[PDB]
Symmetry: D3
Subunit: 124 residues, 6 copies
């Protein structure tokens, strides 16, 4: 189906699913994170929807939402916090460095698209 195959294979808290159809650029713009667990009453402990910006912000017709950069900045902030606290680890430091370099490349993309004046249009 549309349940994501993840790099983590054991002890997974949640599954992630694509919602809707492929949209601009070939990607999905809505996802659900839902728990692999249940309460005693049978509903999901976790059922969170994430909508991404689909179409440009400057247009009302567009689905306004989050961008990849926001999620990574959240994860970065939490990792910096965890490293400053009592349960730090070398794995956290390595993950954090990769998260920040991914963030830098995404920012490199936005800036390149500004220089070429293509930010916000459906063009390579």
């Amino acid at each position: 189906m549309k349940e994501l195959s993840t790099i983590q294979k054991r002890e997974k808290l949640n599954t992630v699913e694509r919602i809707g159809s492929e949209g601009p650029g070939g990607a999905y713009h809505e996802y659900v994170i839902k728990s692999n667990s249940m309460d005693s009453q049978g509903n999901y402990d976790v059922y969170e929807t994430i909508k991404f910006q689909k179409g440009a912000r400057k247009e009302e017709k567009s689905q306004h939402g989050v961008i990849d950069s926001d999620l990574l900045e959240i994860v970065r902030d939490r990792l910096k916090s965890f490293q400053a606290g009592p349960f730090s680890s070398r794995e956290n430091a390595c993950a954090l460095t990769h998260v920040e370099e991914a963030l830098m490349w995404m920012n490199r993309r936005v800036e390149d698209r500004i220089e070429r004046n293509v930010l916000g249009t459906n063009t390579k």
Copy 2:
């Protein structure tokens, strides 16, 4: 301020804020992503809350929520989609490799923790 200082400085679609207080491990467990734009009535175009798992999933008193690798798996899937579509870029390729290596390091944490019998406990 609780607004996060992000790597991206220009043309930001959204602002990210920590919500609540630092808790287990020294990290925040809820964040809000909100638009830098507003609608006619003056309401936000995007006002998205993300809640993270706080406390072990087995326990009912615990706040159940997402984990960081879910967010990165979403971003990873979207980057793979974009790279297969008409708007690919070398910047995407580098961001994607870093996102996957961050995911691989996070998995390494879970596996080390399983090996040491500390998964799900407040211990290094």
Copy 3:
């Protein structure tokens, strides 16, 4: 020759040679590491053959042997040992991180091939 061109060009303890013919996947499955030095009597100081698994382990026809992740795990263990000991270095630290990321990618390969039910088969 079939001697391997190495990244280290100076003060090399040993030379490495490819042994045999290429086979499955375009690769060789036996190697010899021999010292660049001879003893008081003229015999080689070091002469190791390393045989790799050739064909699936589950088939009786196969040349059973080692796989690359085994060698890398040995090197990882030795580098971690050296870093915990009195002769640590930053060069060791950089090497160690790359060896671990190579292992993580080799394992990604294994997990992908299991997911697609192709592990142990001659299929891309």
Copy 4:
């Protein structure tokens, strides 16, 4: 025990064990790779030993053996061959780049040591 905890968790062909005790720098200098499979007589399908250089090469009393870059050069050559063949993969490319960068850092160590005149000597 002396069994190494590896990054790979599923479908492991072999196990690696440390042999003996700590030597110079805090590392072990002999390892065994043995299959997780056995023949009819209960003998190992694979049992191979790798011995590392312990003590400087010139001193003749030293335990002469392989060095880590020899193993990494083998793995690098095999990965290059696989990438040229029909069973290539992106995981192979990422692993190969990391293996090569580990080799480049191992050479850098050697070159610094030659420069500081401390090669072959038990000195940081």
Copy 5:
């Protein structure tokens, strides 16, 4: 135009400009660095030209000059100094690792071109 589009966008000390014509390999071989500030007289605080080797050193007619690894070695030395000094930062440490790895890859290029017996020639 002729001005380089740089990764740094705010508080830039200087501008970098391409000088002259496209040359061997498709690159430019003269660059100019000039301050974004000017003095009381209206003259530039900085106006520095860097010429690069265009053509082989052995031939007299060719423009003798610097090579890129020279510039990176200077930056590496300065970064090592700053890391030993009071104004170190994690950003400096990451930049330094990348500069050294870029240098090592430039050294791979030199070493390979030696081995294929093409160093100093206009050949792929």
Copy 6:
């Protein structure tokens, strides 16, 4: 020794030399790059000085000059050109990616300092 211990050891075209004294932050602010070869009168074929910014630009009293990121942007531009031309190489591609990531970390430093109000001051 004010001469630089470089990563390339063979077939070097130029030598790089420290000029002047240790300065602010513990680093050198002038360097000379000189040809290993010779002009018939005996002057060096290449002899070029690069002076770095020492002290803040606004202060007239400072030594005005180039900054490290200027040199890396030149090298980046040359690497991108070479990769678009007939003499590309995989070594160039890796070198270029590392040069861009070093530049991004240097810009990450400038921004952090701006944020904390220390840019242009002698403080972390």
